């Protein structure tokens, strides 16, 4: 939270995770059409790609694999059953597996 906390490389990675976590959610739920926020449009591309992907979870796609990662950290820190995050709902509904769309 703050004070005398230390961010090690590993934690800074997890921090960048939560950053691209928020990036994922933002893109997933961004209703603002004029929002040209850099991470938004980039995430929205990454997200909307998973939508039309088929190599996603069969151990093929990198993008959809990594997006699954972000959505999974987030999936535990999420409650919404109709969450905007694509891979969140696939993950936190399965809970056991990970593959999206089974």
């Amino acid at each position: 939270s703050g004070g005398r906390a230390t961010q090690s490389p590993g934690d800074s990675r997890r921090l960048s995770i939560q950053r691209a976590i928020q990036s994922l959610v933002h893109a997933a739920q961004c209703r603002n059409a004029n929002c040209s926020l850099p991470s938004c449009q980039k995430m929205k591309r990454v997200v909307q790609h998973t939508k039309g992907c088929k190599r996603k979870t069969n151990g093929g796609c990198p993008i959809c694999k990594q997006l699954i990662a972000l959505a999974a950290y987030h999936a535990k820190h999420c409650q919404e059953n109709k969450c905007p995050v694509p891979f969140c709902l696939n993950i936190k509904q399965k809970g056991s597996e990970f593959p999206a769309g089974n």
Binding site: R13, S16, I17, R19, A20, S23, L24, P38, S39, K42, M43, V46, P62, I63, K65, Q66, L67, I68, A69, L70, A72, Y73
Partner: peptide, 16 residues
């Protein structure tokens, strides 16, 4: 197992 390596935060690394 236990969180995949999230290359997405590398693919989309936010810099200003």
């Amino acid at each position: 197992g236990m969180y995949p390596d999230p290359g997405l935060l590398s693919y989309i690394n936010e810099l200003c």
